[PDB]
Amino acid sequence: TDFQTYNGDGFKLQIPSKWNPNKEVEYPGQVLRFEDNFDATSNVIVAITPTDKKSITDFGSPEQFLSQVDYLLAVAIANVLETSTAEVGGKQYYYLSILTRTGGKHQLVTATVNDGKLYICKAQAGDKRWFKGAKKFVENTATSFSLA
Numbered sequence: 001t002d003f004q005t006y007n008g009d010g011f012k013l014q015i016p017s018k019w020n021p022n023k024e025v026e027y028p029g030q031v032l033r034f035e036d037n038f039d040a041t042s043n044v045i046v047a048i049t050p051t052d053k054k055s056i057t058d059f060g061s062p063e064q065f066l067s068q069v070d071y072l073l074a075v076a077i078a079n080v081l082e083t084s085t086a087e088v089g090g091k092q093y094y095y096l097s098i099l100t101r102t103g104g105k106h107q108l109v110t111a112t113v114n115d116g117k118l119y120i121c122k123a124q125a126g127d128k129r130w131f132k133g134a135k136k137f138v139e140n141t142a143t144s145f146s147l148a
């Protein structure tokens with residue numbers, strides 16, 4: 001109920017039901033941007049770019065991957081808090097949770113590689129929307145990202 005299933009070009013994810021699309025492009029390869037109408041710092045994007053890589057693991061570790069796409073994050077401090085990996089349909093997924101400072105922004109990145117394309121999903125919220133009951137709008141959103 002709190003989320004709506006979004007079917008995109010070769011992917012799917014859960015998007016907070018009250019968020020609205022924004023056509024303004026902020027990221028290279030951006031194909032999706034949804035945000036809280038009342039606070040644009042709460043948002044999710046999906047970006048698709050060409051890659052010669054065959055798996056997200058080709059980048060190295062999750063942290064090594066993030067270093068190579070640091071355009072995703074003026075940010076003065078970026079702390080990787082936790083990482084994870086998963087495998088679905090023979091495809092590897094990387095997950096990172098990040099706190100950035102120029103309070104801070106709470107960001108979650110999901111990434112995978114398929115069919116000559118790099119897929120990145122990033123969701124974020126500021127302190128005002130980082131509280132018990134609202135974290136799912138960042139966390140479920142980003143971790144729900146799947147190839148389809």
Ligand SMILES: OC[C@H]1O[C@H](O)[C@H](O)[C@@H](O)[C@@H]1O
Binds near residue numbers: 016129133134137
């Ligand atoms: O508490 C519920 C609210 O939490 C956050 O502010 C979300 O951005 C919003 O979409 C949701 O309705």
